[PDB]
């Protein structure tokens, strides 16, 4: 009987069963549902870890080990959480890249909501990482938190405020546990709002050309395409959990607390590398953090810089080359962000930083304009 009339299943039907979708959406389109799976994944394992973790300075590092050694299967649950956080970023990255390449950002509202979803998960992962009170957890917590101190005039009252003291201590570990528990529920609401705005127009596709003449039902097609792709997300997640639990995980969080001693070479998680390089590039306190913020906050300027008469980059050889130069540049930032602030590296790191911004703020838009002229448009 009917899916269409019931006030509840009607939502389901309109979102996952009868929703008209482009016959041609690619694998690149699988990431949104994978981001949903990621969020649920983080939520379940996250929760079971909360049934055993304790938020006090003393027993924090210890309770986590209690989980990995004592609590039945805590190790598998703990690793799925950690590796799930990485996958979540892997997915954010692909998802945001897919939107750039294919012009999807032209759906203003849904793209703007996405940026919010990006910042929310970054906020979430940060608080998360601090939780086990390891060396990197602590020093990473110290670095990132201090960014706020750069803000003129009110900078220090703010860090101390967010600290609940004179430095990252007791009060901060507890509040971070709290905010880290509620954030993913708030994320979940923003994501439903994301999905609402998207349905208003439906999905874009590889060609950037309207698909209203060739829509297919989300259900049999994307239902199975999404299943298959979930299993791929799962294989990749398990491989990590079950063969390489410590691979992305820094060895220093396996050593408790040292507010007195900063490790020789503190290294961000992975997904912060490129942004870490940008912040570091410029030898200035204020300007570094400003460059850092702008490095992410730039996504919301992207739509103003669309210059081409076409939506997607599928028929745009110039933009394509510049897009990959962007990716290749990010990969350079990543490499550099994980390296000591020295000779070859600072200069490479400064040139990659101007390139990132140079290509988004100027190169891409100029390619679009010459592609238009080349076509006589």
């Amino acid at each position: 009987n009917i899916r269409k009339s019931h006030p509840l299943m009607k939502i389901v039907n309109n979102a996952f069963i009868d929703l008209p979708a482009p016959s041609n959406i690619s694998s690149w389109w699988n990431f949104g549902s994978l981001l949903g799976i990621c969020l649920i994944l983080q939520i379940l394992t996250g929760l079971f870890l909360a049934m055993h973790y304790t938020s006090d300075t003393t027993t924090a590092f210890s309770s986590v080990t209690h989980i990995c050694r004592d609590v039945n299967y805590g190790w598998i649950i703990r690793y799925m959480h950690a590796n799930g956080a990485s996958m979540f970023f892997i997915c954010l990255y692909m998802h945001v890249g897919r939107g750039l390449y294919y012009g999807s950002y032209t759906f203003l509202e849904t793209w703007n909501i996405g940026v919010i979803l990006l910042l929310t998960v970054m906020a979430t992962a940060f608080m998360g990482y601090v939780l086990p009170w390891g060396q990197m957890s602590f020093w990473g917590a110290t670095v990132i938190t201090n960014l706020l101190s750069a803000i003129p005039y009110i900078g220090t009252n703010l860090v101390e405020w967010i600290w609940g003291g004179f430095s990252v201590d007791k009060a901060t570990l507890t509040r971070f546990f709290a905010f880290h528990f509620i954030l993913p529920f708030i994320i979940m609401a923003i994501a439903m709002v994301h999905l609402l705005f998207l349905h208003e127009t439906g999905s874009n596709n590889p060609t950037g050309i309207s698909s209203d003449v060739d829509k297919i039902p989300f259900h049999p097609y994307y239902t199975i395409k999404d299943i298959l792709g979930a299993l791929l997300l799962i294989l990749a997640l398990m491989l990590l959990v079950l063969f390489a639990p410590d691979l992305l995980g820094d060895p220093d969080n396996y050593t408790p607390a040292n507010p007195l001693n900063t490790p020789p070479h503190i290294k961000p998680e992975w997904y912060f590398l490129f942004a870490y390089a940008i912040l570091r590039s410029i030898p200035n306190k204020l300007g570094g953090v400003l460059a850092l913020a702008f490095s992410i906050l730039i996504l919301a300027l992207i739509p103003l810089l669309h210059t081409s008469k076409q939506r997607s980059m599928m028929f745009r050889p110039l933009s394509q080359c510049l897009f990959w130069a962007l990716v290749a540049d990010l990969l350079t930032l990543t490499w550099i962000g994980g390296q000591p602030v020295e000779h070859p590296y600072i200069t490479i790191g400064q040139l990659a930083s101007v390139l990132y911004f140079l290509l988004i703020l100027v190169l891409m838009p100029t390619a679009g304009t010459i592609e238009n002229k080349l076509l006589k448009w």
Binding site: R69, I76, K225, L228, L231, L232, M238, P251
Partner: protein, 240 residues
């Protein structure tokens, strides 16, 4: 000062994808922690029961636990005595407040416990090569006090006296307690102390690839079946 070298190449018998531990070597390795390392290094997270599963036997585990004295809970007078040795809380803790380890050893703090994975890149190897690779301090550089020199370590210089080849033994088997053999065993054991789940994980891991190798092709075939209709559809335009 800031220069340094990295560990050799790992042939452990627990290096590959699927690869158990040589539980016999985990035994020998505990014996090394028992007689030598224990007197300086705290192993705060392992317990006598943890071994029951791995290297010993129910009865054996009790017996080895009984060879020490911990500070048991208070009774009617508000006391604090000592007790035979449980089976439920390793913890031979060589030093009270950590600063006592500093006092004894002189500056240097004998770190962690259930080692490797721990803050040491190249985990087991770094340790193996640290213990097994003490060498003569080359020309040009002195040592503020006869500290102790080690090619690996950060800064090539500092701390721990070379404690391997003082051929302590109690390997039953009939195994020669040599420099290396005692190290291979200690690292092996330390591997298990840091990662007890190691063997179950790779058995699961096996199952994950085996299952994934069944499901992947199958789910893929389900999707192609349903997408058949679109993939082979044919179009024709027939305007007036």
């Amino acid at each position: 000062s800031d220069l340094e070298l990295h560990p050799p190449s790992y042939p452990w018998s627990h290096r590959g994808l699927l690869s158990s531990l040589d539980h016999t070597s985990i035994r020998r390795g505990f014996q090394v922690y028992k007689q030598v390392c224990s007197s300086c290094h705290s192993m705060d997270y392992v317990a006598y029961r943890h071994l029951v599963g791995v290297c010993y036997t129910e009865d054996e585990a009790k017996a080895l636990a009984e060879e020490v004295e911990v500070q048991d809970g208070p009774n009617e007078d508000g006391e604090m005595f000592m007790r035979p040795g449980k089976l439920s809380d390793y913890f031979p803790k060589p030093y009270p407040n950590p600063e006592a380890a500093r006092a004894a050893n002189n500056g240097a703090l004998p770190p962690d416990l259930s080692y490797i994975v721990r803050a040491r890149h190249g985990g087991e190897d770094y340790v193996f090569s640290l213990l097994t690779g003490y060498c003569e301090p080359p020309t040009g550089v002195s040592l503020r006090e006869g500290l102790y020199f080690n090619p690996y370590f950060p800064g090539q210089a500092i701390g721990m006296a070379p404690p391997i080849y003082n051929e302590v033994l109690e390997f039953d088997d009939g195994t020669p307690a040599t420099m290396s053999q005692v190290a291979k065993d200690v690292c092996t054991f330390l591997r298990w102390a840091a990662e007890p789940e190691h063997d179950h994980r790779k058995r699961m891991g096996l199952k994950m690839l085996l299952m994934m190798g069944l499901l992947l092709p199958l789910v893929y075939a389900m999707k192609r079946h349903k997408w058949s209709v679109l993939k082979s559809r044919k179009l024709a335009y027939r305007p007036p």
